[PDB]
C-alpha cells in the first residue's frame, strides 16, 4: 500500500493514556525481521511506552538496537500468525533502515529513549518498560482506527449483564481489569455503572 | 452533529454476513423514543436482519410500526445507559418520519419487509430495507466483535500453560461462538488456527 507521511500520533488519533493492540516489528543485527502483538501505551503526541516480558525475540531485538516500528492492523490472521508462530519473510517491508509490516494500515518508526526494569505481579515476572519516541508516522488510505479493547470490555460486560453467578462476577472482574488497563474515563465510568447495577 | 447522505450500507463499510453492535432506535404511536443495543446482520448493500427476543419495547415497537433506525456509536456510556435503563428524551433526534440517536457517528432508516416468529424463548427474525444512510465526520467503523473474539483467544493462548485447561476450554469455546456468529472468513479462520494450535 501507499502511505502518507504525518507529523505525529494525532494522525492515528491515538489518545494519551490509552493502550493500543498493535503489531510490533523488530529485527536482529542481520536485519532478520520479527513481528509480535504488543500493547503500545500512548503517552503524548510523539511518545509511547511498551511493557515487554523477558526472553522474547521482541525484547532482545529492541534492547540490541533501540529501534522498532509499531504497526496498525485489524486483520485477525496477522495477529494470529504472529502469535502462534513467525510471519513469512515477505510480511516485512523496509522503510529507511526500519522494517515494518507489509500491508499495515499505518505504522510509525520508534527509537528507545529509556528502559527500566519492573516487577510484575498477577494471576511474579520482571518486565522492561521501554519508552520511545515516534519518528515518522505513516498512514494508508485503509486506516480507520488503532485497535483498543476498552469498548469491547464494556460490551462483553453488558452482554453478561443482560443474562445475569461466580463465573459472572469473575467475567465482570476480568473485563473491569481490561477497561482500567487500556481504557479511558468513559469506559471506566461505564464499568462503574455496570458493577453498581450488579450490586443492586 | 452534521451528516452526509449516502445511498447504501457500503458508505458505512458494512460487509455482507457480518453482525454489527448498534443502538436501535424505535418509537411507539405517540412517538415516544426507545433505544437499546441490538445486533444488526448486514445481508447486502441495503438489507439487514435483526433477531429480536420477546418482551422488549424494541420488538413491541418494531412489530407495531415496521420502522426503526440503526445507529453507529462506539461510546461505551450510550451502550451502557440504554442497557441498564432508558435514554432520556434529549438523546433522540428527528430525521424525516424517523427518530435516531442524538450524536450517532452514523445512522440509517429501515423499514421492515418481513417478520418471522421463531421458537426456550420466542424470537422474531426481522428483515428490513435500508432507506437513508447518514454519515457524520466522526464515523470510523461500525462495531463488530470478531477481532475482539480473536484477540481474547490469543491472550488466553499465550497464558495457556499457566491456567487450568477447563476455564481455557470454555473461554475459547465462547470466543469461537462469537467469531462464528459475528465474524467473517478471516476471524473464523483465525479461530480455527488457534484451536488447532491448542490441540497440538
Ligand atoms: C493481543 C496480545 C497482546 C500482547 N501484548 C504484549 C505486551 O504488551 N508485552 C509483551 O511482552 N508481550 C505481549 N504479548 C505476548 C507476545 O506477543 C508473545 O509473547 C509473543 O509470542 C512474543 O513473541 P516473540 O518471541 O516473537 O517476540 C501479547 C500477545 C497478544 C496476543
Ligand atoms: C451488545 C448487546 C447486543 C444485544 N443484541 C440483542 C439482539 O440482537 N436482539 C435482542 O433481542 N436483544 C439484544 N440485546 C439485549 C437488549 O439490548 C436488552 O434486552 C435491552 O434491555 C432491551 O431494551 P428494551 O426493553 O428497551 O427494548 C443486546 C444487548 C447487548 C448489550
UniProtKB/Swiss-Prot annotation, chain B:
Signal peptide: none annotated. It comes from the Archaea. SUPFAM superfamilies: FMN-binding split barrel (SSF50475). Disulfide bonds: none annotated. InterPro entries: DUF447_C, DUF447_N, Split_barrel_FMN-bd, UCP018747. Transmembrane segments: none annotated. To M.jannaschii MJ1453. This is Uncharacterized protein MTH_863.
Amino acid at each position: 500500500v501507499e502511505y502518507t507521511h504525518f507529523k505525529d500520533l494525532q494522525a492515528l488519533e491515538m489518545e494519551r493514556g490509552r493502550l493500543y493492540e498493535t503489531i510490533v516489528v523488530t529485527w536482529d543485527d542481520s536485519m532478520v525481521g520479527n513481528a509480535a502483538p504488543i500493547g503500545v501505551l500512548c503517552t503524548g503526541d510523539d511518545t509511547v511506552t511498551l511493557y515487554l516480558y523477558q526472553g522474547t525475540r521482541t525484547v532482545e531485538n529492541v534492547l540490541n538496537n533501540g529501534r522498532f516500528t509499531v504497526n496498525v492492523t485489524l486483520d485477525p490472521l496477522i495477529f494470529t500468525d504472529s502469535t502462534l508462530g513467525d510471519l513469512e519473510e515477505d510480511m516485512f517491508s523496509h522503510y529507511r533502515d526500519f522494517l515494518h509490516l507489509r500491508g499495515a494500515d499505518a505504522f510509525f518508526t520508534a527509537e528507545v529513549v529509556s528502559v527500566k526494569k519492573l516487577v510484575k505481579r498477577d494471576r511474579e515476572s520482571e518486565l522492561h518498560v521501554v519508552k520511545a519516541r515516534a519518528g515518522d508516522v505513516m498512514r494508508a488510505e485503509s486506516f480507520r482506527m488503532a485497535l483498543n479493547r476498552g469498548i469491547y470490555a464494556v460490551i462483553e460486560s453488558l452482554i453478561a449483564y443482560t443474562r445475569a453467578p461466580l463465573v459472572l462476577r469473575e467475567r465482570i472482574a476480568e473485563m473491569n481489569r481490561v477497561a482500567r488497563k487500556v481504557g479511558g474515563p468513559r469506559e471506566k465510568e461505564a464499568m462503574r455503572r455496570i458493577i453498581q447495577a450488579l450490586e443492586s
